Amino acid sequence: DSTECSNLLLQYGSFCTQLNRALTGIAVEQDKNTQEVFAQVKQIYKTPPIKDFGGFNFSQILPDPSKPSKRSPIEDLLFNKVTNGLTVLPPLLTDEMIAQYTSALLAGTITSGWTFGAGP
Amino acid sequence: DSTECSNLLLQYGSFCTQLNRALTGIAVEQDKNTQEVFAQVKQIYKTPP
Amino acid sequence: TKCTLKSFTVEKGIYQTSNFRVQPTESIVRFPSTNLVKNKCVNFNFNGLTGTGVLTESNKKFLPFQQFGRDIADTTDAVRDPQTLEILDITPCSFGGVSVITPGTNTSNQVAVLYQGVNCTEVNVFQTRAGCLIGAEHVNNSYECDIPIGAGICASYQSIIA
Amino acid sequence: SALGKLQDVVNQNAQALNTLVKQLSSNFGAISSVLNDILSRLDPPEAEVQIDRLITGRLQSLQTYVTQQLIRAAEIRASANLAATKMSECVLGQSKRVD
Amino acid sequence: QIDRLITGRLQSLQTYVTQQLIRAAEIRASANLAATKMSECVLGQSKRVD
Amino acid sequence: QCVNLTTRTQLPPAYTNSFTRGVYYPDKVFRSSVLHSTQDLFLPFFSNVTWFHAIHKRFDNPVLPFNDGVYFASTEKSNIIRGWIFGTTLDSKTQSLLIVNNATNVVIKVCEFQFCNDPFLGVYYMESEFRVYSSANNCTFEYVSQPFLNFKNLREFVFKNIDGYFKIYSKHTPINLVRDLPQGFSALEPLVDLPIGINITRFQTLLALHRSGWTAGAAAYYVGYLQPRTFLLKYNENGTITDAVDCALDPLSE
Ligand SMILES: *[C@@H]1O[C@H](CO)[C@@H](O[C@@H]2O[C@H](CO)[C@@H](O)[C@H](O)[C@H]2NC(C)=O)[C@H](O)[C@H]1NC(C)=O
Ligand SMILES: *[C@@H]1O[C@H](CO)[C@@H](O[C@@H]2O[C@H](CO)[C@@H](O)[C@H](O)[C@H]2NC(C)=O)[C@H](O)[C@H]1NC(C)=O
Ligand SMILES: *[C@@H]1O[C@H](CO)[C@@H](O)[C@H](O)[C@H]1NC(C)=O
Ligand SMILES: *[C@@H]1O[C@H](CO)[C@@H](O)[C@H](O)[C@H]1NC(C)=O
Ligand SMILES: *[C@@H]1O[C@H](CO)[C@@H](O)[C@H](O)[C@H]1NC(C)=O
Ligand SMILES: *[C@@H]1O[C@H](CO)[C@@H](O)[C@H](O)[C@H]1NC(C)=O
Ligand SMILES: *[C@@H]1O[C@H](CO)[C@@H](O)[C@H](O)[C@H]1NC(C)=O
């Protein structure tokens, strides 16, 4: 909050603008990375209510209806096992929407194979 | 070996720690690179005589 | 936004334009002196320890020798008043980025403002996890993301909706 | 140690933030690291010099932090591009690429 | 005078560490490519052209 | 009044292990659930701490150096140890510090005391004997406070002199160990900061005689010396230092 310090800092030019621009570029790059990795399908696929897959069990990877986060047991375990002018910007995609994207990918690859990745 | 220089250098804080940690990260990264490239088999095979 | 981007035409999107800092409304001195003002962003001087913050009642259990409390980063996050022995948390005053959400100037001149990481009571009002949004009406319908706000929230023009 | 790759990134980012905040406690050759102490103890002709020393030290620290942040951003971007490639080729199709 | 020497040598060391980090990133990318070629060209037959 | 004690038994002073004692709070700052690294004048872990006895006929009042600071441990029962003497020459030429704890209160005086060769207090079997100094001419600082105080009681004190400020740290511990220092950890709370502003290089322990000649009550004290070093202190959720690491002791702790 020092006015004299800011007045002396203005003598150095646009260093602060450069640093803010670089941090903004990193911040938008993280969101672009998350879009590139997880948002590769424009259809939200869902599994059938009857889990008849010829003996194959996907309960550990499909979302659990009992959990409020709508995560798989594996994803829930993964989330449990990971623990002065500074601000932290929230990610554009929240964890439940990323879980929804993974659920859509799982439903597509289980019910349709590789067909959903190449078209209908 | 100048003690006055080190006493003045302590005023600048942990720059030296950051430089040492970055170099240590590069040094372990080289070993990780060699491990990923060459150690792709866990059995040492030999040709027949 | 036009001044920040150095252009008279602004494309559609969100642009970081300014920084919002809650200015200290009063100055408080406490020596072994003025009255103690809590829950407001004020300057404080406790036993020669100067600073700026919001004073709140604390649940910490300072031992008698202990006077001011430091956090991980060695900033004073709790202080004991030297006259009445009570503990007060010192939350840093509300600061955040000010971002302007706008469509293209070819389309419209309407804008909305996002105060990042700032609650709506210290500044069409809508509270998001990303911050307080002023000027955009919140709708219950879901569309594709046009202008990203954050925390699952996006904005579009149809007035500006969020 | 199964999830060491994510924890390494989290630890590196937290450590970089802690170092950047910690660098404010250093005076960088000035009489004090607190701006208010310098402004209240000295006249503006010498306080300008002390504030200048603090400004150049803090600016060097911030530029250094931004530099490693950009390098780590490049590394994370490369890892994310690899992850997107694995998502496209292993999940959305069957890959003939060995390993 | 020692402060001038310290800031000059510190700037030189920061420059060296920064360019070493950039070269380390380049070498890491090349090594990842080499590991990919080791997996796909030596340990199998690759249909990828060139 | 001064009295020579001529019934002592000649014996060399003993030595023992410090274990993990001598840790004090380095400052007045509350810290919770944190690991804090501090560089200050501390007593090294597992160091050679000098052991002095008071038993009957041992009466250990030697002339000891102060150096950078002094850790004073006391395995005490029945209240024999009463105070300390600090100074450089311990006479009227220089200015000296007096700390006493008599039957009523704790008195700190900074005066040019002409000290006795054997300064002591006395208990008659009531306190009616005091022979520490013969004169006090120029007094600058006075401070009267509350009483600070098988072996049943453990008294830890840390005396430091930095920038003309005398920092006294204290801790009172209930123990039941018979002969030596118990092995454990106890952080010493800061007791008082005195603006005495005097040069201190030598110190004396003050004891109390028991009269029914004289008899020495069963007591034992330990003197350790502080060195500038780094410790890693652990602060729990309640702000109490619960464990410590000596940064220069062994490579594991380093
Ligand atoms: C699929 O696998 C899941 C988990 O392995 C099975 O769920 C288990 O069912 C048994 C018997 O009902 C329970 O005792 C276990 O506690 C269940 N495990 C969990 C994690 O809940 C499930 O029965 C399998 N089969 C089908 C058709 O879903
Ligand atoms: C107690 O013993 C000490 C030690 O002998 C006496 O101190 C001496 O006092 C004489 C006085 O004429 C001096 O000349 C000596 O140089 C002193 N010696 C030391 C080592 O300081 C002290 O006087 C004795 N007390 C009494 C009351 O006689
Ligand atoms: C303590 O010092 C004495 C001599 O001053 C020595 O004989 C003894 O062995 C030392 N103790 C330890 C544990 O080193
Ligand atoms: C203890 O010392 C003080 C200070 O001289 C004195 O006033 C008090 O009477 C003393 N108490 C006893 C029991 O001698
Ligand atoms: C100290 O005491 C002596 C004798 O009592 C006296 O001559 C001298 O002036 C005193 N010094 C001070 C500073 O009071
Ligand atoms: C304190 O006393 C010692 C011993 O007489 C001496 O060497 C030292 O220089 C003195 N320090 C000061 C500041 O007077
Ligand atoms: C801290 O204090 C609480 C009570 O306030 C107690 O239950 C807890 O056990 C204490 N923690 C430790 C480590 O002693």
UniProtKB/Swiss-Prot annotation, chain B:
It comes from the Viruses. Precursor of the fusion protein processed in the biosynthesis of the S protein and the formation of virus particle. Mediates fusion of the virion and cellular membranes by functioning as a class I viral fusion protein. Contains two viral fusion peptides that are unmasked after cleavage. The S2/S2' cleavage occurs during virus entry at the cell membrane by host TMPRSS2 or during endocytosis by host CSTL. This is Spike protein S2. It comes from Severe acute respiratory syndrome coronavirus 2. The gene is S. The chain holds residues 745 to 793 of 1273 of the full protein.
From Swiss-Prot, chain D:
Residues 7-51 form a coiled coil. Changing L39F: In strain: Omicron/BA.1. Changing Q12H: In strain: Omicron/BA.1, Omicron/BA.2, Omicron/BA.2.12.1, Omicron/BA.2.75, Omicron/BA.4, Omicron/BA.5, Omicron/BQ.1.1, Omicron/XBB.1.5, Omicron/EG.5.1. Subunit of the fusion protein that is processed upon entry into the host cell. Mediates fusion of the virion and cellular membranes by functioning as a class I viral fusion protein. Contains a viral fusion peptide that is unmasked after S2 cleavage. This cleavage can occur at the cell membrane by host TMPRSS2 or during endocytosis by host CSTL. In either case, this triggers an extensive and irreversible conformational change that leads to fusion of the viral envelope with the cellular cytoplasmic membrane, releasing viral genomic RNA into the host cell cytoplasm. This is Spike protein S2'. It comes from Severe acute respiratory syndrome coronavirus 2 (2019-nCoV).
UniProtKB/Swiss-Prot annotation, chain F:
It comes from the Viruses. Changing V178E: In strain: Omicron/XBB.1.5, Omicron/EG.5.1. Changing G122D: In strain: Kappa/B.1.617.1, Omicron/BA.2, Omicron/BA.2.12.1, Omicron/BA.2.75, Omicron/BA.4, Omicron/BA.5, Omicron/BQ.1.1, Omicron/XBB.1.5, Omicron/EG.5.1. Residues 236-254 are annotated as: Putative superantigen. Changing R155S: In strain: Gamma/P.1. Disulfide bonds join C2-C116, C111-C139. Residues 122-137 are annotated as: Disordered. Changing R155K: Partial loss of biliverdin affinity. Residues 1-254 form the BetaCoV S1-NTD domain. Glycans are attached at N4, N48, N102, N138, N199, N238. Changing D60A: In strain: Beta/B.1.351. Attaches the virion to the cell membrane by interacting with host receptor, initiating the infection. The major receptor is host ACE2. When S2/S2' has been cleaved, binding to the receptor triggers direct fusion at the cell membrane. When S2/S2' has not been cleaved, binding to the receptor results in internalization of the virus by endocytosis using host TFRC and GRM2 and leading to fusion of the virion membrane with the host endosomal membrane. Alternatively, may use NRP1/NRP2 and integrin as entry receptors. Binds to host ACE2. RBD also interacts with the N-linked glycan on 'Asn-90' of ACE2. Cleavage of S generates a polybasic C-terminal sequence on S1 that binds to host Neuropilin-1 (NRP1) and Neuropilin-2 (NRP2) receptors. Interacts with host integrin alpha-5/beta-1 (ITGA5:ITGB1) and with ACE2 in complex with integrin alpha-5/beta-1 (ITGA5:ITGB1). May interact via cytoplasmic c-terminus with M protein. May interact (via N-terminus) with host bilirubin and biliverdin, thereby preventing antibody binding to the SARS-CoV-2 spike NTD via an allosteric mechanism. This is Spike protein S1. It comes from Severe acute respiratory syndrome coronavirus 2 (2019-nCoV).
